[PDB]
Amino acid sequence: ATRILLLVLAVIIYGTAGFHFIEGESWTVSLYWTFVTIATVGYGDYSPSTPLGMYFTVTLIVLGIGTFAVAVERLLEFLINREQMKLMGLIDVAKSRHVVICGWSESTLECLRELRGSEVFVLAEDENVRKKVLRSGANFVHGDPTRVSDLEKANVRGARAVIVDLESDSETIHCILGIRKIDESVRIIAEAERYENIEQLRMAGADQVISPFVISGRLMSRSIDDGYEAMFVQDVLAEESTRRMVEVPIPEGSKLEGVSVLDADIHDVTGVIIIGVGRGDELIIDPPRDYSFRAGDIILGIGKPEEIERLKNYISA
Amino acid sequence: ATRILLLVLAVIIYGTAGFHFIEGESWTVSLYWTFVTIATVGYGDYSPSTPLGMYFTVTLIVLGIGTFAVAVERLLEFLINREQMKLMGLIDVAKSRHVVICGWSESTLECLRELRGSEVFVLAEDENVRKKVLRSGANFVHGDPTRVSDLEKANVRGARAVIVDLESDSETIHCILGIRKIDESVRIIAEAERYENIEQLRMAGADQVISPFVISGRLMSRSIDDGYEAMFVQDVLAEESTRRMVEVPIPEGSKLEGVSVLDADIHDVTGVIIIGVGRGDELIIDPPRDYSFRAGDIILGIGKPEEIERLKNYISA
Amino acid sequence: ATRILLLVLAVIIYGTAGFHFIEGESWTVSLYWTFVTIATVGYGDYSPSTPLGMYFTVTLIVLGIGTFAVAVERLLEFLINREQMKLMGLIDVAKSRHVVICGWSESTLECLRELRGSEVFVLAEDENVRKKVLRSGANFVHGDPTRVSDLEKANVRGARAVIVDLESDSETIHCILGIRKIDESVRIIAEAERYENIEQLRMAGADQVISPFVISGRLMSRSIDDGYEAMFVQDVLAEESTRRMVEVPIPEGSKLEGVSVLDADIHDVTGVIIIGVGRGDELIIDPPRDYSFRAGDIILGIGKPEEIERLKNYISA
Amino acid sequence: ATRILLLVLAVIIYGTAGFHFIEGESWTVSLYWTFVTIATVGYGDYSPSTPLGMYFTVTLIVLGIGTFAVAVERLLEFLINREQMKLMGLIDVAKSRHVVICGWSESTLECLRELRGSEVFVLAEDENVRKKVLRSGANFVHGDPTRVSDLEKANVRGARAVIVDLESDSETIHCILGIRKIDESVRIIAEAERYENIEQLRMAGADQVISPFVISGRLMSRSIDDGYEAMFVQDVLAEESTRRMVEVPIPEGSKLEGVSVLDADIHDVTGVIIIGVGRGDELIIDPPRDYSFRAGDIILGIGKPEEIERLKNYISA
Amino acid sequence: DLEKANVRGARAVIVDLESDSETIHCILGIRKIDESVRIIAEAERYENIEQLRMAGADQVISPFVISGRLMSRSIDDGYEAMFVQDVLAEESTRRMVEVPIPEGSKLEGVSVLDADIHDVTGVIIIGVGRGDELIIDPPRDYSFRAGDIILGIGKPEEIERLKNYISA
Ligand SMILES: [K+]
Ligand SMILES: [K+]
């Protein structure tokens, strides 16, 4: 274990005294000689001439080769064990601003194309998930996301945001309850499968609850006859073909801090339909004619990629 | 990561100045000394005699051993990671004239005995398929053949020909549609399982559609009473016991460029039954008595391995 | 296999005689020269000047490099084989006071938080059990716990205590019968699943038989109306919220060796309800008013963590 | 691939000429110098003094370190690839008197306790079979035993005897048919499961056909009332508690070559019941009173381990 | 659940399960229900024969150990497997037979040397069994009792002469 330093210093203190009290040179010269011989340098400036030292150099050399044959094998054992343990998970995350994506599905493969590669840590248990993650460019941390003793290996206490997407609703609720036990302040984003579980995911402690299956089942039964709201939803949120739903922040100053929506008149000026303003963690959809803008607000609107650029210029100062 | 070169050049520029401004030798001599000491050569032609340098050589040697203990471990980590990642797939193909065989079945094990070993790249997802491929002498590229983000890892854009054979017809149609999205010019060869899917495989964009199950089911229900066409099909296409179905090209000149089949009279001269001629990506089965041969044609015929040699001599010039 | 020492001594005895009977130096000088050259030290104090020796040093050096290229590869093959075999089990336990936990379940994950990490050896056959054990901090020994040829690899003959917990009752009974064939003295602790198998586990040779499912099924059907005994059982044995069931031993002397429970009066003095005394591998629950304490007894009682400390002071001498 | 020797000889022929046509020493001296420098020996007997050579030694040393960094990495890649491929099968057997045990069951674990460990080669396809074989002390050769292209990897053409025991009767018949296609002379020993397949296994080409299930089903239905033949079969063939069924060969001479069973009288002399004599690949059970012994015969008898020793002395000469 | 198949009061219970631990447990259960019924187990491994005997079984038939021993003896020589396969398994020409000695039938009070069974009938007297104890290789100082079961290896033509010769 720790005997590498022991054997090294033992061989060194052996060679030092062996040259000092045999060849009769100074302590400094003996230290220099053992440090230029133990490294197989061989300057030949202080070669031993006494036959006893002429045999003693042999045992010094074989001891040095023994130390170099034990330290190399120990380092290689350590490296192989680390590269075989870290490859199949079993490693502890040490980052401080990473994103933990519990579970793995298709809905979490479309959230790795808007983030970085080494910034996310998929926390799943299956096997093929490991290969899929390594293909997608993320990091894989083996463990059961429902076990609180495994959510600390991904360092969920110091995470930027957690994205929960598991195989059912029971596992999602349990993972949310487990995360809310470690850090009360982390931001959780869950995926509700059934409709009756959205209130459960909100009570358990999720900050945002997305439900793709409910939206899909509500658009399938309303697009049988005509199918118009499906076209808007698709061509705005899914593909972003000709439109885009954007949220533009308002900076300090901004040349419109304090003006009402009547006098601002964002639609007839920039061409972006104003859905609602994000006044501090609550959405006021279609703000009335008396709402006055402020600093730090977030305007939510639909517009072409040209009108969004024409809007981000009207709000800057 | 990149600190290997940093530490190496740091130790080198350290030893150079350390010998120059202590032993008082030239810059060239100091560079030579640090490059013959850092490699444990030890010429002993410029050994330090000053006690301060007599201790300084020790720290130079231990720094060199530290660099050789960090570079070796980094190279070994890299090599182990590469040999453990490349073994189980996860590698990108870099060839430019290879053959990609999506999926794996028995019908694609009989197409590896008429090709090379390192020229094919099986693109499958299962586990046992990897061992079967490594036994058959091919290369294994892990990935889902239906995902367009995985068909680019096998480099299907610069492939010679692609052979699609999957577990169903839905996966075959989807893989063909995925391949036709990357490169419009690559040659696809699909295997249709059901009869009703041959037109689907032809519409999706396959260049050649083979259907073994349809042929088998048509030969099984026609070989109950007598079973003669089954004998021809088997002993011509499957085993090649006494006959063989060959396609012989016509070169420039060829001593028969322009002659009609009446005057050529290939059967009564060579003994090979002329099924049809391959005039430019269309098969004219049993060409009429007025068809005139050209250059670049491909004659399709049945004959013994002796009559094929007697025919390949009649068409050469 | 063993040819490393052969080749090393062959090269050494080759170089010794080669320098002795060519350069004409003493046997000691030749041994010193081959031992400072084979290690690439190069003192240069006895460099060969004869052209024949000037070529002979070349073959000595290439032979030495060959030995260093065969010994390194053999050591690396051995180390890789050991680190790849030991990782997935297949190793023999050599300890002498370890705890063998046959099988793996949840009831054996709560017994690894009251023991050490390197002191236990989980003996299971499944795959995911290996990763769970390596996460829990224990050691994994691959093998089938029911096979007597596999119970000797965990060294059950020299174990401190064995904890049997398998997937059924048949496997538990068979593992107990297998353990009682190797060592008659080892202490077995089984987990009975069904009620009708407790007498079977006691007859087969188990020393202690725990049945969690029987207790759970007896507390579930008695806690429908009121549910009071469930509260006692839970808040005493499971959570230890405000109480704790402790067993305190009596040492030599102890200031109460020989007194009756009437005169001792442990409850009204310390505040710990005396359930029973452990007189030598038999439990006398509620000892009568005439039972006299002795040395080596074990008092079993319920009390707060303060009353337990007030009791462990009343019994010491 | 093969560029190791190329780079080595290139660096050597570079250093030789570089020292010869710069320092002006002989060709032999230059060869000696490059061979004592490329190995980091550093005798210092021919150190370069010209500044141009004083810089040239640097490039020689860095080229040597480059060769030692490419050869080490190539050797390590080769060794890791071999130890990772050979571990999971995929290797070709090269022995010439080994025993191939196709398939794996319990009936082939009791035939590894009467053979050696490194003499057998289990040829199976499953995964857990590999670990079971490596525990039992045998060698594992991955492959499908029914495929003729996989029976040649175990070298069934030069095997001592093959033992077929698979999961069904269809696989056993197919494996026997596959083995009889490679080598007509090898000795096959099959295990018939159903009764109706014994004649099939004998026709397919098996040399010996054992059927444990037929014997078990015939002893189960005859041991309901009394159960005596079951006792004989068990306590003679299975456990060998007090008896043993032995086959003793007759050597040249043997002091009874030519005598009839009447005059030999083996039972009343040695105490071993004579079941039958093995006259040349046919069993004559209960030879008549006129059968005359010969050389090379094999006597089959039941007797205690003392009577077998008393018989092996009566037949020797 | 064994109380549904009426394991109490039956001729014999033939225990043959998919594993060995289940066999041991089923035997232990049957011995809890009925303490006198006849059990005929079947051991898979060799180390589990003493276990099945101590659990309460009466006759343990282990075919896998038999086949595993015959698979290693027939690699080079291969003669005992022939006898086993031609006697116990297929019964091609010679089959193992057990015949009881009826009351007062030509044998009450006669030794073996003057019984001369092998020479007048043709069967091979392997062993005679009285009281659940098979006496293999009976000694010359042994008398026949009406109730012993004679075990023998003989052709179907000689078993008849044996059953007639030991008749009243
Ligand atoms: K060196
Ligand atoms: K030197």
Alpha carbon of D22 to ligand 1 centroid (Å): 24
Q: Reduced to 3 states, what is the DSSP secondary structure of residue E87?
A: helix
The answer to whether D285 and D276 have CB atoms below 8 angstroms apart is yes
Judged by CB atoms closer than 8 Å, whether chains meet at E83 and D214 is answered as no
CA–CA separation, C233 and B56 (whole Å): 72
User: Strand locations in C25-119, DSSP E?
Assistant: 99-102
Count Cβ atoms within 10 A of the Cβ of residue C257 and give its class: 0-12 exposed, 13-18 middle, 19 or more buried.
middle
Please state whether at least 3 CB pairs lie below 8 Å between chains A and D: yes
Write down the experimental method used for this entry. cryo-EM
Element (H, E) at D26: none
* E157 and E121 fall within a common domain: yes
Whole-angstrom CA distances from C220 to A204, B312, C180, C183, C198 are 27, 90, 35, 39, 20
Contact call for residues B26 and B72 (beta carbons, < 8 A): no
Half-sphere exposure of D52 (CA within 13 A, CB side): 6
In order, the DSSP letters of chain B are --HHHHHHHHHHHHHHHHHHHHH---HHHHHHHHHHHTTT----SS---SHHHHHHHHHHHHHHHHHHHHHHHHHHHHHHHHHHHTTTS------SS-EEEES--STTTTTSSSS-STTEEEE---SHHHHHHHHHT-EE--S-TT-HHHHTTTTGGG-SEEEE--SSHHHHHHHHHHHHHH-SSSPEEEE--SGGGHHHHHHHT-SEEE-HHHHHHHHHSSTTTT--HHHHHIIIIIS-SS--EEEEE--SSTTTTT-BHHHH-HHHHH--EEEEEE-SS-EEES--TT-B--SS-EEEEE--HHHHHHHHHHS--
Facing residues of A300 across strands?
A: A247, A276
Give the whole-angstrom CA distance, residue A267 versus residue E108: 123
Same domain, yes or no, for E85 and E152? no
Is residue E103 domain-shared with residue E155, that is, in the same domain? yes
Strand pairing of B188-191 and B208-210? parallel
Q: Do E98 and E85 belong together in one domain? A: no
Alpha-carbon distance of D59 to C277, in angstroms, equals 85
Instruction: Tell me which residue of C197, C182, C167 sits closest to C103, measured CA to CA.
Output: C167
Scored b (16 or more CB within 10 A) or e, E44-57 reads bbbbbbebbeebbb
Residue D307 vs residues A166, C86, D312: alpha-carbon distances, Å: 72, 48, 9
User: Cα distance from A16 to chain D (closest Cα, Å)?
Assistant: 22
The tokens describing C201, both together, are: 């586990």
The b-or-e profile of E102-131 (16+ CB within 10 A means b, else e) is: eeeeebeeeebeebebbeebbbbbbbbbee
User: Are B90 and A135 within 8 A, CB to CB?
Assistant: yes
CA dist B151 and B214 (Å) reads 29
SS3 A164: strand
Phi-psi region of C205 (alpha: psi -120 to 50; beta: other; left: phi over 0): left
Give the C-alpha separation, B304 to B271, whole Å: 9
- From residue A298, how far is each of A87, A236, A276 by CA, in Å? 43, 19, 9
Rounded to a whole number of angstroms, the distance between the first and last alpha carbons of chain A is 64
The answer to whether the beta carbons of residues C191 and C216 sit under 8 Å apart is no
d(CA A195, CA D199): 65
* CB contact (8 A) between residue C168 and residue E21: yes
- Cα(C38) to ligand 2 centroid in Å equals 14
CA A240 – CA A252 distance, rounded (Å):
30
Asked if A62 contacts A38 with a C-beta cutoff of 8 angstroms, the reply is no
Cβ burial, residue E74 (10 Å; 0-12/13-18/19+): buried
Shortest CA distance from C132: residue in chain A: A143
- A47 CA from centroid of ligand 2 (Å): 9
Question: Within this chain, do residues E110 and E125 fall inside the same structural domain, yes or no?
Answer: yes
Between strands A188-191 and C298-302, the pairing is unpaired
Contact A142, C131 (CB under 8 A): yes
Same domain, yes or no: E161 and E104: yes
Burial class of residue D52, CB neighbours in 10 A (0-12, 13-18, 19+) = exposed
Looking at the complex, report in whole angstroms how far the Cα of residue D185 sits from the nearest Cα belonging to chain E.
13
C44 CA → ligand 1 middle, Å: 13
CB A7 within 8 A of CB D8: no
Q: Give how far D215 is from chain E: nearest CA, Å.
A: 5
Beta bridge partners of B274: B301
Q: Which of C201, C213, C132, C129 is nearest to C172 (CA)?
A: C201
* Whether residue E68 is found in the same domain as residue E104: no
Measured CA to CA in angstroms, residue E79 lies from A186, D209, D244 at distances of 77, 12, 15
Look at strands B161-164 and B99-102 and give their pairing. parallel
Ligand found nearest the CA of A42: 2
Q: Please give the structure tokens belonging to residue B58.
A: 């020790």
Please name every residue paired with D122 in a beta bridge, in sequence order, or none if there are none.
D101, D140
Checking DSSP bridges between strand A161-164 and strand A188-191, what pairing results, if any? parallel
CB-neighbour burial class of residue A210 (10 A; exposed 0-12, middle 13-18, buried 19+): middle
Within 8 A of D41 by CB-CB distance, chain A residues are: 42
In 3D space, the residue among D176, D106, D101, D187 whose CA is nearest the CA of residue D146 turns out to be: D176
Dist. CA C260–CA C266, nearest whole Å: 10
Task: Please report, as a single letter, which amino acid is at residue C177.
Answer: L
D274 strand-pairing partners: D301
What does the block give as tokens for C104? 């793996």
Cβ C182 vs Cβ C205: under 8 Å: no
Q: Tell me how close the Cα of D90 comes to any Cα of chain A, in angstroms.
A: 22
Whether residue A54 and residue C32 make contact (CB cut-off 8 A), yes or no, is: yes
At E118, which CATH number? 3.30.70.1450
Under DSSP, the state recorded for A210 is E
- Residue C211, φ and ψ in degrees, nearest 5: -135, 90
**Per the structure block, which two tokens stand in for C24?**
């004409």
Residue A238 one-letter amino acid: A
Sheet containing D120-123: give its strands across.
D139-140, D120-123, D99-102, D161-164, D188-191, D208-210
3-state secondary structure of E153: strand
Residue C142: both structure tokens together: 């691959």
Q: Could you give the C-alpha distances from D15 to A149, B33, C51, in angstroms and in order?
A: 62, 19, 19
Q: Does C36 sit within 8 Å of A57, measured CB to CB?
A: yes
Q: Is residue D310 within 8 Å of D270, Cβ to Cβ? A: yes
> Using an 8 Å Cβ cutoff, are E143 and E151 in contact?
no
Which residues touch A2 (CB under 8 Å, ≥6 apart)? none
Say if residue E50 carries a ligand binding annotation. no
CA angle B296, B300, B306 (to 5 degrees): 110
Alpha helices, DSSP H, located in A86-211:
128-136, 148-151, 169-182, 198-204
C-alpha distances in Å from residue A233, one per residue of A216, A238, A243, C171? 10, 7, 11, 58
SS3 D41: coil
Binding site listing of D: 165, 191, 193
C48: Cβ–Cβ under 8 A, 6 or more apart, which residues? C19, C22, C23, C54, C56, C57
Tokens of B307: 């009559």
**Is A114 within any annotated ligand binding site?**
no
D36, D109, D128, D129, best to mutate vs chain C, most C CBs in 10 Å? D36
Range of the domain at B257: 219-313
C-alpha distances out from residue A124 to A104, A140, A179, A183, B90, Å: 7, 8, 15, 20, 19
Cα(D245) to ligand 1 centroid in Å equals: 68
The β-bridge partners of A133 are none
CA dist D244 and D236 (Å) reads 5
CA distances from E69 to C154, D104, D171 (A): 28, 15, 22
Strands of the sheet with C298-302, listed across from one edge: C245-249, C298-302, C273-278, C283-285
Q: Measuring CA to CA, which residue among D133, D142, D190, D143 is closest to residue D163? A: D190
- How is residue D119 written in tokens? 């003499």
CA-CA-CA-CA torsion for D191, D193, D197, D202, nearest 10 degrees? 10
Question: What values do phi and psi take at E134, rounded to 5?
Answer: -80, 115
Question: E3: which 2 tokens?
Answer: 């109380």
Q: How far is the CA of B41 from the centre of ligand 1 (A)?
A: 5
Beta bridge partners of B147: none
Q: Which amino acid is at E127?
A: G
Q: Do A44 and D44 touch (CB under 8 A)?
A: yes
DSSP string, E93-141: S-EEEEEE--TTSS-BT--STTT-HHHHT--EEEEEESSS-EEES--SS
Tell me the sheet residues that pair with C286: none
The CATH code of the domain that includes E83 is 1.20.5.870
Rounded Cα–Cα distance for residues C75 and A77 (Å): 11
Q: Which helix (H) or strand (E) holds A113?
A: none
CB C313 within 8 A of CB C269: no
The closest of D3, D9, D138, D2 to D64, measured between CA atoms, is D9
Contact B96, B114 (CB under 8 A): no
* Dihedral (CA of E5, E7, E11, E14) sign: positive
- Give the Cα separation of D10 and C173 in Å (integer): 71
**Ligand that lies nearest to the alpha carbon of residue D41, given by its number in the listed order:** 1
Question: Do residue A42 and residue C36 have CB atoms under 8 angstroms apart?
Answer: yes
Residue with tokens 């609703």: A169
Asked whether at least 3 C-beta pairs link A and E within 8 Å, the reply is no
From residue D166, how far is each of A184, C229, D102, D171, D200 by CA, in Å? 59, 57, 7, 6, 15
Q: Three-state SS for D278?
A: strand
Counting other chains too, the contacts that B235-238 makes at CB distance below 8 Å and 24 or more residues apart are B236/B302
Cα A73 to its chain centre, rounded Å, is: 34
Contact B230, B238 (CB under 8 A): no
Contact at 8 Å (CB) between C279 and C271? Answer: no
Task: Determine the distance in angstroms separating the CA of A26 from the nearest CA of chain C, rounded to an integer.
Answer: 20
